Every structure is written in structure tokens, then in C-alpha cells.
Amino acid sequence: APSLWKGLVGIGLFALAHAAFSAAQHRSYMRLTEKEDESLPIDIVLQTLLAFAVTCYGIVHIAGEFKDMDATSELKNKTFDTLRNHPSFYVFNHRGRVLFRPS
Amino acid sequence: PGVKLTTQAYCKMVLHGAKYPHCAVNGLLVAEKQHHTLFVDCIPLFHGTLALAPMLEVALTLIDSWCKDHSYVIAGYYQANERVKDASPNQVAEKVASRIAEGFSDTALIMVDNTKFTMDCVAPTIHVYEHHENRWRCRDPHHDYCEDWPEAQRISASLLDSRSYETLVDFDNHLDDIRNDWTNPEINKAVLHLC
């Protein structure tokens, strides 16, 4: 699912860049002709807005973490058996060591 | 009075000890009440701290409720120490032995050794202590407590070789997860099939 969102964001960005290039070409043409104070075509403007709205949808989905506020829920599954052992104090005196010693 | 036990219970005890090789283990053998003392099967009580009466009351009362359901009687209780060079009974063990000796007239204290605990077990590697309300603390020098020895070696070697002992469940796992039972059905199926 994240890969699809990333690809969609990339495609939208590419479409936005293409719309920018089209608008640049339109203004370059406009500078050629005297007067003619007209606006850019509405179709490419709508394409620009479509590319802007699509890229803002995946930009929120890509980073969604929203962790739980309460601090009791993560330790709701953890068992006291694992907590009983600690990594500081480890005594290396067990029957498994002499049982696994030959093999 | 001789002490005789079936290979199933001994395999259960060894297997529960293998499940937690870094902490002490606890078990309870069950006999049939109706001179030699025959043991039917054992159930693992707890592991880890192994110095608490509260959960012991729960477990023992549950076992009592169980023994009145299929007409059983609690025979004895066995305990293994954490340190390898330790083969002396702790005070809690004697207290539990006296508690079971109040009701039943034959409670042996079984001690799992740690020095002779390897893949290829020689044979007996069990300490039988004979304790009472008085100051009688004697351990039998060497006797025969298993029925068939070569078959026991073959099944124990097959059980320890093939990694199929992670399914053994304790009373603590029953509290943590109600779903796992504590009768070890798969172990019973395997002991019957291997024979």
C-alpha cells in the first residue's frame, strides 16, 4: 500500500511539472505577441489543481503514525516472565550448558 | 516401600526442565488411591521465582478439584534447583511435602539433579528423598524406579533430539493465556504413539 501512495505522489508531481512547462510555453508565446492581455487556458489550470489535490492526499498517508496516548496499552501484552530476566545480571551456570557441551 | 513411575511422567518432568534451563522448575506427581507406590503422571506447577504461596494455593486447589473429577489423588511434589552444584531440599519443598503428607501417607520428594543432565542420560539421575513431620530425612542410595529402561532411552532421545518440546505448557501459561491447557494432550499422544 505505501508503494502505491508513493507512486501516485510521484505521478502527480510529474503532472504538476508538465503543467508548469505548458504554462511557461504559453507565457513565452504571449511575450511574442503585442497586447493580447489574456489568461492561461482553464484546462491546464484544472489539471494543475488536480495534480495539487492528488499529491496532498498521499503526503498525509505516507506519514501516519498516531500512536496511542495512554502508556498502559503497550505493556498490556508484555509478560512478567520476560521482565524477570535482566541483561545486566546473567549467571552462566545452567544444566543446558553441560547438556549442549558435547554436541 | 518401593517407588515406581511410568515413563510418561519422567519424560514430562525432564521435558519441563528442558523448557526452562535457566530457572528452577516445579512439578507435581499424581498417583491412584484405592507395598509399592505407583505414579501415574505429573503436571508442571510454576517456574522462575518459585518462592510464592499465593499462586501455589491456586494451583494446588485446582489440582485438588481435578483429582475429585477423575478419581485421582495427589502423590508427591518435585523440585529442581537453579545452581548445578545444589542437591539439598529447600524449606518451601519441605513445607509442601508436609502439607501433602497430612492427607496422603506416602509423599516422596523428587530432586532433579543438574550435574548428570545431558542429551545422552546414563539412566537414573533422580534423587528420592523420604521426608516426614519428624526429623527423618533419608535418600535412597540407588534403586529402580522406571519400568522399561531401553525403551525409555529411545523415547527420551527421540523427544529431546526432535525439537517438539516447545508445546509443553505450565500453570503460569494457563493464567497468561487461558487457551493452552495444562494436561499436555500432544505429549500424551506422542508417548502413546512412540511406544
mmCIF file of N, CA, C and O in Angstrom, chain B residues 15 19 155 157-169 184 186-187 190-191 194:
data_model
loop_
_atom_site.group_PDB
_atom_site.id
_atom_site.type_symbol
_atom_site.label_atom_id
_atom_site.label_comp_id
_atom_site.label_asym_id
_atom_site.label_seq_id
_atom_site.Cartn_x
_atom_site.Cartn_y
_atom_site.Cartn_z
ATOM 1 N N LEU B 15 11.164 -32.932 30.351
ATOM 2 C CA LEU B 15 10.863 -32.019 29.262
ATOM 3 C C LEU B 15 10.574 -30.627 29.810
ATOM 4 O O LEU B 15 10.999 -29.613 29.242
ATOM 5 N N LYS B 19 12.508 -27.109 29.160
ATOM 6 C CA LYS B 19 11.845 -25.905 28.667
ATOM 7 C C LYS B 19 12.469 -24.644 29.257
ATOM 8 O O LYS B 19 12.699 -23.656 28.551
ATOM 9 N N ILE B 155 12.761 -43.348 23.696
ATOM 10 C CA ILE B 155 11.732 -42.309 23.585
ATOM 11 C C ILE B 155 12.279 -40.968 24.058
ATOM 12 O O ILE B 155 11.971 -39.919 23.484
ATOM 13 N N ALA B 157 15.436 -39.964 23.965
ATOM 14 C CA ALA B 157 16.354 -39.487 22.939
ATOM 15 C C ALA B 157 15.598 -38.930 21.742
ATOM 16 O O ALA B 157 15.968 -37.891 21.189
ATOM 17 N N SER B 158 14.528 -39.615 21.323
ATOM 18 C CA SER B 158 13.721 -39.100 20.221
ATOM 19 C C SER B 158 13.033 -37.790 20.589
ATOM 20 O O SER B 158 12.940 -36.885 19.752
ATOM 21 N N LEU B 159 12.547 -37.673 21.826
ATOM 22 C CA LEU B 159 11.844 -36.468 22.251
ATOM 23 C C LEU B 159 12.785 -35.277 22.372
ATOM 24 O O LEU B 159 12.405 -34.152 22.027
ATOM 25 N N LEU B 160 14.003 -35.496 22.866
ATOM 26 C CA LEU B 160 14.961 -34.410 23.037
ATOM 27 C C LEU B 160 15.661 -34.049 21.729
ATOM 28 O O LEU B 160 16.000 -32.883 21.507
ATOM 29 N N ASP B 161 15.883 -35.037 20.860
ATOM 30 C CA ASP B 161 16.521 -34.785 19.573
ATOM 31 C C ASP B 161 15.619 -33.919 18.701
ATOM 32 O O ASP B 161 15.987 -32.806 18.308
ATOM 33 N N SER B 162 14.426 -34.420 18.392
ATOM 34 C CA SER B 162 13.457 -33.656 17.618
ATOM 35 C C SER B 162 12.927 -32.513 18.475
ATOM 36 O O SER B 162 12.435 -32.739 19.586
ATOM 37 N N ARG B 163 13.028 -31.289 17.960
ATOM 38 C CA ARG B 163 12.595 -30.118 18.711
ATOM 39 C C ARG B 163 11.077 -30.020 18.712
ATOM 40 O O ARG B 163 10.492 -29.255 17.938
ATOM 41 N N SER B 164 10.431 -30.797 19.585
ATOM 42 C CA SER B 164 8.980 -30.795 19.706
ATOM 43 C C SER B 164 8.551 -30.580 21.152
ATOM 44 O O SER B 164 7.461 -31.007 21.551
ATOM 45 N N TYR B 165 9.399 -29.929 21.951
ATOM 46 C CA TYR B 165 9.137 -29.738 23.372
ATOM 47 C C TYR B 165 8.814 -28.287 23.720
ATOM 48 O O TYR B 165 8.756 -27.933 24.903
ATOM 49 N N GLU B 166 8.598 -27.439 22.719
ATOM 50 C CA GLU B 166 8.165 -26.072 22.964
ATOM 51 C C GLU B 166 6.677 -25.979 23.268
ATOM 52 O O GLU B 166 6.219 -24.937 23.748
ATOM 53 N N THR B 167 5.918 -27.047 23.009
ATOM 54 C CA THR B 167 4.480 -27.045 23.240
ATOM 55 C C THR B 167 4.106 -27.311 24.692
ATOM 56 O O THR B 167 2.953 -27.076 25.066
ATOM 57 N N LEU B 168 5.037 -27.808 25.506
ATOM 58 C CA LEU B 168 4.737 -28.080 26.909
ATOM 59 C C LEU B 168 4.287 -26.805 27.603
ATOM 60 O O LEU B 168 4.942 -25.763 27.503
ATOM 61 N N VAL B 169 3.170 -26.896 28.309
ATOM 62 C CA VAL B 169 2.529 -25.739 28.903
ATOM 63 C C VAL B 169 2.506 -25.893 30.416
ATOM 64 O O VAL B 169 2.380 -26.994 30.959
ATOM 65 N N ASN B 184 -1.260 -31.376 28.762
ATOM 66 C CA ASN B 184 -0.334 -31.744 27.697
ATOM 67 C C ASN B 184 -0.876 -32.891 26.834
ATOM 68 O O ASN B 184 -0.347 -34.001 26.867
ATOM 69 N N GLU B 186 -0.848 -33.339 23.522
ATOM 70 C CA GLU B 186 0.053 -33.749 22.451
ATOM 71 C C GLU B 186 1.174 -34.624 22.987
ATOM 72 O O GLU B 186 1.615 -35.567 22.323
ATOM 73 N N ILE B 187 1.645 -34.331 24.202
ATOM 74 C CA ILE B 187 2.692 -35.151 24.807
ATOM 75 C C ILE B 187 2.171 -36.559 25.077
ATOM 76 O O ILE B 187 2.880 -37.552 24.877
ATOM 77 N N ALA B 190 1.998 -38.390 21.818
ATOM 78 C CA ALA B 190 3.331 -38.780 21.371
ATOM 79 C C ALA B 190 3.872 -39.957 22.175
ATOM 80 O O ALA B 190 4.508 -40.855 21.612
ATOM 81 N N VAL B 191 3.647 -39.972 23.494
ATOM 82 C CA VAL B 191 4.158 -41.085 24.295
ATOM 83 C C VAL B 191 3.446 -42.376 23.911
ATOM 84 O O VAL B 191 4.057 -43.450 23.857
ATOM 85 N N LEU B 194 4.787 -43.349 20.177
ATOM 86 C CA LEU B 194 6.178 -43.788 20.107
ATOM 87 C C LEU B 194 6.332 -45.217 20.612
ATOM 88 O O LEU B 194 7.163 -45.982 20.108
#
